């Protein structure tokens, strides 16, 4: 449904109305990671070798039914359908009709 | 991979079966005791290329 490399649009969250890209999708818990969306402030272990007494800020994963794949030819995040006469499913946006990648 | 780059010769099965079992996995489990965490992912691969060399000799029966 949603994979890494394509834009999204958060529809339901504290950081809604924000585009971005997918970083890494947890497939079992159905959670995706988008940059700049639901960022943390981790109290890191400053006895680690890397830093000197600080607070990390890495993005936190959101569930896959909070992003929605967009093709703004009519300024709209759409849903996905599947067409194939080529031996492999080419992904189709049903609300506009164009072939996306 | 390895699965059908084998089926090369009948006689060179056992002469490579004894070459990897005896002379590779025995060196790679002595060096694990005296200190090596350099390639501790070669021990899985030179063991799963023995199973492929003792499966093909059943097809030649």
């Amino acid at each position: 449904h949603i994979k890494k490399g394509d834009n999204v649009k958060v529809i339901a969250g504290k950081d809604k109305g924000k585009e971005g890209k997918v970083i890494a999708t947890l497939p079992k818990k159905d959670r995706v990671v988008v940059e700049g969306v639901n960022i943390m402030k981790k109290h890191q272990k400053p006895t680690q070798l890397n830093p000197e007494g600080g607070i990390l800020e890495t993005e936190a994963a959101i569930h896959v039914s909070n992003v929605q794949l967009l093709d703004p030819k009519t300024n709209e995040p759409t849903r996905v359908g599947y067409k194939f006469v080529d031996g492999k499913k080419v992904r189709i946006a049903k609300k506009s009709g164009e072939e996306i990648k | 991979m390895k699965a059908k780059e084998i089926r090369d010769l009948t006689t060179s099965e056992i002469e490579e079966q004894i070459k990897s079992s005896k002379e590779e996995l025995f060196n790679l489990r002595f060096q694990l005791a005296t200190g090596q965490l350099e390639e501790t992912a070669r021990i899985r691969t030179v063991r799963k290329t023995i199973a492929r060399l003792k499966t093909v000799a059943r097809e030649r029966e």
């Binding site: - | 079992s21 005896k22 025995f26 489990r29 002595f30 694990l32 005791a33 005296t34």
Partner: protein
């Protein structure tokens, strides 16, 4: 044939007799005779005595459930010609 799983390099009783003796951890089920014809068809040396001993499984306990470790047979070769059968 390979009935020598690992060597063992512990503190004194394994590495403070290294002028002629060496210590392996053999597989079970085997003799002290087969080890004479197993450390000779690898390293090309000539043994003089092989001694074996058996340890029981001993009890470890981690978490909230106890279990036993694995039993092991230990062999101690002693050479006549050549040296340095471990590196």
């Amino acid at each position: 044939r390979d009935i020598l799983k690992r060597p063992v390099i512990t503190e004194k009783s394994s590495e403070a007799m290294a002028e002629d003796k060496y210590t392996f951890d053999v597989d079970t089920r085997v003799n002290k005779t087969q080890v004479k014809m197993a450390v000779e068809e690898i390293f090309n040396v000539k043994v003089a005595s092989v001694n074996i001993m058996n340890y029981k499984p001993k009890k470890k306990r981690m978490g909230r459930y106890q279990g036993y470790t694995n039993k092991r047979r230990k062999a101690i070769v002693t050479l006549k010609e050549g040296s340095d059968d471990l590196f």
